[PDB]
Write a protein that binds this ligand. Sequence first.
Ligand SMILES: [Co+2]
Length: 9
Amino acid sequence: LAEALHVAL
Ligand SMILES: [Co+2]
């Protein structure tokens, strides 16, 4: 979750 959102952003 954390990576997914950090890379989306
Ligand atoms: Co974080």
